[PDB]
Design a protein around this ligand. Structure first.
Ligand SMILES: O=c1ccn([C@@H]2O[C@H](COP(=O)(O)OP(=O)(O)O[C@H]3O[C@H](CO)[C@@H](O)[C@H](O)[C@H]3O)[C@@H](O)[C@H]2O)c(=O)[nH]1
Ligand SMILES: [Cl-]
Ligand SMILES: [Cl-]
Length: 351
């Protein structure tokens, strides 16, 4: 029973990019699950084997982490091309991990064929014909179906909380009490639409000492629909394996909703925040039924609530430590179901 996992459009090497990090972490939990798996990427490396040195059919299961197939600058992207070439060669069912709503499986061929460099690839090389099973991180399978209407070889859908991969790691560790230098923190990237609207709502013009780390930049928030005067401080990106420690520098860390994610997906951020030394504050819209934690104090409806909640935390160290104690307990309750999570994953990939 040999398993192969690949990222469909991003080179995998270390934890310096989210796509690479996610692929490696998934590789790790699958291995720790007692399964034989290899990550196949562009070149051999610490965690990977290269496409050019393995036969895709020496594997019994092919797992693919979602990615975009857009060609930056209209030029060839080997990460995308080599992965799809690998996928098109596979003759069994493909398991597509849907962790980002905007990244549904898509064929690169229709795009490539009209490129000036189309001479480099044939339809047979890139056209993926194997049946595909979408493993949706979101509980709402209709959202997954809707996103995959343009591809007809996707004939199965199943929900699985993929994002719990960090908390089930053998070396997982809660963050310890950390000296506070921030009131609120958020580590991530800029995204248009509702996410943008909400980032402005919860992180801008708050009057609090807020930091936004990651790939975001103040200049990206220029939509007249979401006006702001004072922005939070933006700092650079850090490796994914240091996110919870970074979150810990703040009194509170935020979970912000987005269209189609609300009451559907639980995102990696939820666990990274819950496991940190920062109190987890959640955008009410993201989890209206309070499925994450049945305690209203961890939820903020708007900029006003956030400000008050944060002040309440700044004014009562006991309240802060109490909420941390509770979120940490709730986190471990999910961690205690590791065996169930592992069994559900195996079932998801027909094992
Ligand atoms: O400096 C930074 C800041 C953030 N991150 C990571 O980036 C992740 C994603 O952040 P962001 O780009 O804002 O996307 P989200 O909307 O928070 O989450 C997306 O990415 C997650 C991880 O793939 C998935 O669980 C979600 O479903 C998907 O929407 C974070 O959780 C962190 O692990 C870093 O590695 N370095
Ligand atoms: Cl998305
Ligand atoms: Cl981390």
């Amino acid at each position: 029973m040999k398993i192969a996992i690949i990222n469909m459009g991003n080179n995998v090497i270390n934890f310096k990019t989210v796509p690479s990090s996610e692929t490696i972490y998934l590789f790790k939990v699958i291995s720790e699950m007692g399964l034989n798996v290899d990550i196949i990427s562009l070149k051999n490396g610490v965690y990977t084997k290269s496409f050019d040195e393995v036969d895709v059919n020496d594997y019994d299961r092919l797992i693919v982490v979602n990615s975009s197939i857009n060609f930056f600058g209209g030029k060839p992207n080997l990460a995308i091309l080599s992965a799809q070439k690998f996928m098109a060669k596979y003759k069994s069912k493909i398991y597509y991990l849907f962790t980002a709503i905007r990244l549904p499986f898509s064929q690169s061929w229709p795009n490539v064929k009209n490129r000036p460099w189309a001479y480099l690839y044939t339809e047979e090389e890139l056209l993926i014909k194997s049946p595909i099973k979408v493993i949706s991180q979101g509980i709402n399978l209709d959202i997954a179906k809707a996103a995959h209407k343009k591809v007809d070889n996707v004939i199965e859908f199943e929900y699985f909380p993929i994002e719990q991969y960090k908390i089930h790691m053998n070396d997982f560790q809660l963050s310890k009490p950390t000296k506070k230098t921030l009131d609120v923190i958020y580590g991530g990237s800029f995204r248009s639409g509702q996410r943008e609207s909400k980032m402005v709502e919860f992180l801008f013009d708050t009057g609090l000492n807020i930091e936004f780390f990651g790939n975001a930049r103040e200049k990206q928030f220029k939509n007249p629909k979401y006006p702001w005067t004072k922005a939070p401080v933006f700092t650079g990106k850090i490796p994914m394996n240091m996110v919870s420690e970074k979150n810990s520098q703040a009194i509170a860390a935020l979970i912000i909703g987005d269209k189609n994610y609300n009451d559907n997906f639980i995102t990696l951020r939820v666990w990274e925040t819950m496991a940190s030394d920062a109190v987890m504050l959640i955008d009410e819209e993201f989890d209206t039924k309070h499925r994450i934690i049945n305690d209203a104090r961890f939820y903020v409806n708007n900029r006003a609530e956030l400000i008050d909640r944060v002040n309440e935390l700044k004014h009562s160290d006991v309240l802060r430590k109490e909420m941390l104690s509770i979120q940490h307990d709730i986190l471990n309750k999910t961690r205690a179901k590791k065996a169930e999570w592992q069994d559900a994953f195996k079932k998801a990939i027909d094992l």
